[PDB]
Amino acid sequence: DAYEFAVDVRDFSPEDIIVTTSNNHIEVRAEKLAADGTVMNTFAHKSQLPEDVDPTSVTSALREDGSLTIRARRHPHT
């Protein structure tokens, strides 16, 4: 089984969407610029992964409905 959550990136461009991970957190972040290029819109979704989720297995899939799907596999205890 894997661990996944969704992010709302509907009004942003793929270039500005960024996924930053580390030992126990994932950080999705985007920002939409105007014609000139001034930031008119930005957010930052910073998650706190469980201890069994491997942060190096994080795949990301943008879909046509404007939702970003973060996905990481977990090695549960046995």
Author numbering: 85 to 162
Authors' text:
Though it shares the common architecture of sHSPs (an α-crystallin domain, ACD, flanked by N- and C-terminal regions), HSPB7 is unusual as it has been observed to be oligomerisation incompetent. FLNC interacts with HSPB7, also known as cardiovascular heat-shock protein (cvHSP), via d2417–20. Our work therefore shows, structurally, how HSPB7 acts as a specific molecular chaperone that regulates FLNC dimerisation.
Given the nature of the heterodimer between HSPB7ACD and FLNCd24 as composed of two well-structured units interacting with nanomolar affinity, we considered them a strong candidate for co-crystallisation. We were successful in obtaining crystals of the complex, which diffracted to 2.9 Å, and solved the structure in the P3221 space group. The asymmetric unit comprised a single heterodimer, with the interface centred around a parallel pairing of FLNCd24 strand C with HSPB7ACDC131S β4, and the donation of sidechains from each strand into an adjacent hydrophobic groove on each monomer (β4-β8 groove on HSPB7ACD, and C-D groove on FLNCd24). Note that this is a different site and mode of association to that observed in the dimerisation of sHSP ACDs, which occurs via anti-parallel pairing of β6 + 7 strands. Specifically, the HSPB7 β4-β8 groove accepts M2667 and M2669 from FLNC, while the groove between strands C and D accepts I102. The interface is thus mainly comprised of hydrophobic contacts made between the monomers’ sidechains, with additional stability conferred by polar contacts between the chains. We assayed the strength of this interaction quantitatively for HSPB7ΔN and HSPB7ACD by performing experiments at a range of FLNCd24 concentrations; the instability of full-length HSPB7 (some unfolding is observed in the native MS spectra, and we found the protein could readily precipitate in vitro) precluded reliable equivalent experiments for it. Bearing in mind that HDX-MS operates at a resolution defined by the enzymatic digestion (and hence unaffected residues can appear protected simply by being within the same peptide product as residues that truly are), mapping the protection from deuteration measured onto our structure emphasises how protection is highest near the crystallographically observed interface.
